[PDB]
Symmetry: C2
Subunit: 122 residues, 2 copies
């Protein structure tokens, strides 16, 4: 976009990085609905549920990896940050964390995402 | 004297702010009880009632959101939610991870409805 004042350049980047933050939230939200439906019919039929969960785990990592390039210690106390980074690391290296630690992690990126959004729209 | 259009704009706006504020207030009360719990485990149980009344405020947050819910959880996640909501209502103590997944879920539920209003 052409000849923007330093003012205008700033209001546009704010509006745009706020909108893509929203979009990323809706596309992650939507992705998870997609996996849910597949599980829900997978039972409407052994290892199906293992790869569904492993695929869901891959989606949540890339959701997390998206989140980091929008900005992380901002949002967590120290105890929860290293548990956080252990899981992230584990998912990043293709190993499959403990199912309740992964669920703690899914919810925490979701949570941080919403917190980032609301710190833009307010 | 405001139009319908105008009259409903503010009550929308007021209700958005009404619960944004409601979120920050609960948010800062968790930040408060974390810090007290932090220095409670520095010196050394005092750690425990600190966990206990933290739990008893998240159960209050939940209680306050619901007054304004299966709209956010598939039935699997929904029942694990309701069991652990019940246990805190009855002074039980769920195992830590169960309570964690509960605190995070209600937090996300509050974030979600503030969004339906704002977007």
């Amino acid at each position: 976009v052409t000849e923007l004042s330093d003012a205008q350049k700033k209001q546009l980047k704010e509006q745009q990085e706020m909108q893509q933050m929203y979009d990323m939230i809706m596309q992650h939200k939507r992705a998870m609905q997609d996996m849910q439906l597949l599980w829900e019919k997978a039972v409407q039929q052994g290892t199906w549920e293992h790869q569904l969960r492993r695929m869901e785990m891959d989606k949540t990592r890339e959701w997390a990896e998206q989140l980091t390039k929008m900005g992380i210690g901002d949002f967590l106390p120290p105890d929860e940050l290293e548990k956080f980074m252990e899981t992230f690391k584990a998912l990043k290296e293709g190993r499959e964390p403990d199912y309740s630690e992964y669920k703690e992690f899914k919810l925490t990126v979701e949570n941080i995402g919403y917190q980032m959004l609301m710190k833009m729209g307010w």
